[PDB]
């Protein structure tokens, strides 16, 4: 099942009129000096056994060139982003000679049949709250989180309330109330969510501590601490 | 007008003469600014072409220069035969005062070339140099 | 100000150097390395210096005992005064904002007109 | 002075003390009967049809023909949503015409936008002024209150079951709102960039409908056709332009004022007979035929009839005929200096070489007036007039802002080139860089 | 801290109610804010936004495109001159001379107690009558040096 | 369909205008405003090439490449002398207000601007005047702000508004006093508003996250990935 694999890149064999493709540009600079505090020698590049580009610019990287793998756009005279013209067919359509990648399964001749299991209606049981998914695009994904960038630009970890679920517990906006999922009593601050529905307690999935696994899951002993 | 422009050269008396001897339909002319009329010529016909420039009432005497090219990478070679290599002989003769500059298509497979050494002694070190470092065999 | 136009423009690349930004938002080089032991002493990078801050001085005697020792860095590079050129400063052209230069204050610009002036 | 009906088809009914002409008595004096006529005998094409015969030419300044405008909106019967839209605007410098006729003849307007609405099916019609028509915006609204109480607008009009809502959309001071498609992207709260052409608003217009834009004058010549008919149109003057304009002289002469004229009379009538002439110890120098954005024409031209074509031959255009006139003590450099420095300030923007070169031209011509020109100013200054012609540019703001400064540089560059005192430098040196001296 | 007050609001409305889109109101808000306070501050730009549904983007540039819709805070009567071609013809640099003299200021600032605001206009299509100049409401034509001092106390 | 571009004959789509048709067989005309993505607006007016209606015909008529739709029976000519000085004269119109700001730039290396000063021929300053200066604004960690170095090509504003759905950058100001970006300091929260960096042919929106460890284009090492 994972045989299209193979076609997605050529192999390491793979030449441009027995040349391979370049990663840096022609102008790669500081080649004897980029690395002379460690040793006035400089070393071999690094080979690349493993693909067809190399770790130089003794290479090819032609708008020309008959491959589909373009590592950066650059062609005499058009150095910005703009450069990807002369890499295409037709400006704005298909790459030229084809598109990276390929689709691993086809259409299937017969479809499915109807998925009977209809759920029953969402029935607001007292005590346990439905957790209630809020994906963020800087904040739900496991390695941007870890970027030092995305520190300034993740939200804070609010939870979400209904306005009538938190009068009733007697929340308002901004204080901080404590949950306990798998003896974790953990303490965060609520935001009110006129849009949730009642019963359901909004959680951002992917922040410190709330795993994206906790969607869909109950939630004991939810008070104002 | 400047001196720098793309001139096609068919005003030299030997690319009339060259037309008068082989015929019309054997070899291209390239227009460029070498200042320098180059010819296109086949494979076989370049010895006759190289002993017609020899025994011209004003000879091309002299070869100057003798060395290959890999077109494989160039992109433009509009007006240009087929090639994936090429060899370049540029003569001169200072009887008119003139160059003249025969090129020689060459494909990947069949990088053999006929010798010059015949015609000119001094191309022995150019056909070596020429086989050194582009690989292309002179038999 | 790190713009590595020397280090491009060096035919042989034995220019190596990485740009830093102050608090007010002027650059300048966090390193700057030479290797003099691959240095041809051709001019191109001084010609190639939109600042003229690289320059190539009156001076030959620079033999050494070990070569990983011609490897010079911006502590020995960087000297106390102009140089050649005595009173050119690029920031007095450029419009970018820096310390003691605010937008407008460059040669040859106007001063920013918000577009909440009244004025048509 | 007498206005008859007759050669005086838009300011015969103005009145001595200059007061606005309300609904009883502008229908005393054969009022909204063009609309009568026109809303209960005529179908809306044979309106259009008659107003294309009428040869009624826009108003505004081009020149084009309104029964082929209103012929361009598109036939199917699927779109019923129409706009028709006043271009009250009238930014132009020496242009005063449309305020003398909506500030005394409001319900002129009322009954041609009517007949206009009705010609174009056009079921929703807005005025757009500007903001600094004020008595002008408060009589327009009065009118339109009357002639909505007196069963002139809102619902089934004179019993033909016809309907059209008229608003006042007052402006906020902007010259290129004037513009068409400026105008129409004003209309829809946008910034008024103008619009590429095609699509023409005919097509796709205000809000994607079908929209006809039209002048004030040309909406107060379409009752007097509907009215008094289109042969009587065509027999008011034996020229190629039907109708009367109105016309007149301003700046600095005896009486500058504004009066309605056919087409055909030379500038010369105008300027002597009705303006008076040039005032006491003062002499004729230039005169500009159209507004702001038109080519200066010297006292050899001023025998020359004011229609399109005339003025056209001889490298200028009539524009909205209303002519001012630059004395000799007027410097010449000072007026285009000034000319130019509106148009570079009233431009939107949008595109590069009205905004990135009027100012370079303000910038010049402030040299060539402190007399810190330089060598090459002059030759810039026309090759700016040659890159900032018709087509060049996105919109028609900038050849009409170019067009008095090529005409000023042929005229009068003996002026300019006074202006030229100190050598050119555009460098200062650098020491330590020996300069590169090109020959 | 700003907030439209009732009247601003109906008015807003009733302009919406003229136009099938409420951007086309866009204007019109801007100039019932200008009535109202003298100028368009800051909070009204987004206050604007939300009473149309529009963004407050395309409210700030519509606010900052047009000349006479005021987003810098002006004095108590605004002075608008024209500097046309026929009122430069007809001398309208000694009008501008007489105002500078009597407020003190240049033209686009307001005075130290906020009374007048001068500024330059383009043409006010009254140039058969120039110089001109538009104070708040008032067109004022045939203008003379002299008559600027006798002018100006009509305003306080 | 079939133009005829300096000459020669060309197959193109009539469904395209002349810029994207003649980029695509590989002829280079200068252009600021026109994107593949976006559309074509004819605000920058540089892709200027001189449309001839017959074979036999000399005078022409400059048009808009990016306006101006491929049909079949075109005849245009892109290094006519006419064509050439009034695109040399667009890019020293955006020449004039620009600072002298490309050693101190995160584009410069990478910029259209750049490339297509270069390409017009344009390297002599005759403009000896003062140019226009803009305050910048704070637009969040990712993208940084210089507003100095913008041509008003408004790619910025139609990308963020009529493709991106964005809702806080806009287009301020007037005549020759455009300004672009948010009514006050704020991050710009689209979802999308990294791709103005590539958007903006000039050095206004720059990446912030590249600017605190910045090199050049060609000192950079590039690999295709995921
Ligand atoms: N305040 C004023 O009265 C001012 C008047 N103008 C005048 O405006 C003129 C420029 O006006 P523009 O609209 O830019 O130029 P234009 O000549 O392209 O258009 C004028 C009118 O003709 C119509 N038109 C022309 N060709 C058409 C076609 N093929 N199909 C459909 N409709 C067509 C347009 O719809 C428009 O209503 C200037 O020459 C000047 O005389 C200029 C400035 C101020
Ligand atoms: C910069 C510019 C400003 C214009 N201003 C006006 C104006 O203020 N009033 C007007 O009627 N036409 C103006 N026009 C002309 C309009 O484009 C158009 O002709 C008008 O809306 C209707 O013209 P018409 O009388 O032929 O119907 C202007 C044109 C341009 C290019
Ligand atoms: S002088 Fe030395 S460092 Fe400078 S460009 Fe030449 S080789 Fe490089
Ligand atoms: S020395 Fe000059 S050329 Fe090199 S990075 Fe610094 S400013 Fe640029
Ligand atoms: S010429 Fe261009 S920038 Fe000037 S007003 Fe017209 S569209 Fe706007
Ligand atoms: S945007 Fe481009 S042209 Fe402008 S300063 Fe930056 S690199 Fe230079
Ligand atoms: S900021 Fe950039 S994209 Fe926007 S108009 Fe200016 S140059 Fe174009
Ligand atoms: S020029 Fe001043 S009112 Fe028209
Ligand atoms: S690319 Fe055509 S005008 Fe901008």
Redesign the pocket.
Known sequence: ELAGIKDAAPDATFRIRGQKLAREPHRYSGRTAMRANISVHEPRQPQDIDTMFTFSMEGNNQPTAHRSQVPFAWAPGWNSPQAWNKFQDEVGGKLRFGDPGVRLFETSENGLDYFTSVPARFQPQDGKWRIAPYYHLFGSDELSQRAPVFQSRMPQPYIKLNPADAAKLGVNAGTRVSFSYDGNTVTLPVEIAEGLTAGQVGLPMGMSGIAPVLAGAHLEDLKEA | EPAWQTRDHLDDPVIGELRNRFGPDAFTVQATRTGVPVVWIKREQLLEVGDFLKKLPKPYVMLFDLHGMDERLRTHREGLPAADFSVFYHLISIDRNRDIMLKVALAENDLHVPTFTKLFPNANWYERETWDLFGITFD | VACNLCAVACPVGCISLQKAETKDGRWYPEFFRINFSRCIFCGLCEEACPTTAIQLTPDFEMGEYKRQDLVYEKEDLLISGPGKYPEYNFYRMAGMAIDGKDKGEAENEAKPIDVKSLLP | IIRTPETHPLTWRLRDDKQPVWLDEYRSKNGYEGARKALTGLSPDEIVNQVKDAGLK?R?????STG??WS?MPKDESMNIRYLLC?A????PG?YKDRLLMEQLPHLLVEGMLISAFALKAYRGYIFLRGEYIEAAVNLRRAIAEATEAGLLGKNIMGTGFDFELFVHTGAGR?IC????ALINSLEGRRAN?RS??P???TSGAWGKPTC???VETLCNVPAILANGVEWYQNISKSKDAGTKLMGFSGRVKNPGLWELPFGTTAREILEDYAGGMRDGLKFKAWQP??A??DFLTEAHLDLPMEFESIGKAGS????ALAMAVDHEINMVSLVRNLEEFFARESCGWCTPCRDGLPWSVKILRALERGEGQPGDIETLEQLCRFLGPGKTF???A??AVEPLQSAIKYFREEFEAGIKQPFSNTHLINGIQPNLLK | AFELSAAEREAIEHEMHHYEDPRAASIEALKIVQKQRGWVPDGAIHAIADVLGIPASDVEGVATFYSQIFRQPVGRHVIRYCDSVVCHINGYQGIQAALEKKLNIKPGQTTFDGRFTLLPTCCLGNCDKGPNMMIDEDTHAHLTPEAIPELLERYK | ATIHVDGKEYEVNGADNLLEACLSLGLDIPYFCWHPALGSVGACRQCAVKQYQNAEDTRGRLVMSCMTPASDGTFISIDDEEAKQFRESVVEWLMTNHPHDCPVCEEGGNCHLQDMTVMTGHSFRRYRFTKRTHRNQDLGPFISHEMNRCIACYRCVRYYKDYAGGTDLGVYGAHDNVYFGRPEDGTLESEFSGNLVEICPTGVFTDKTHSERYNRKWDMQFAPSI
Not at chain 4, 60 to 64: E, S, T
Not at chain 4, 178 to 181: K, L, R, V
Not at chain 4, 317 to 320: A, D, Y
Request: aromatic share 8%.
């Open positions: 826009g505004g300044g081009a020149g084009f082929l405008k361009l271009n605007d009238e930014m132009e242009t010259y004037g513009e068409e498609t103008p052409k095609p023409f608003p005919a834009v039209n002048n159209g507004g954005g038109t255009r009539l524009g909205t919109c028609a703001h050849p009409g």
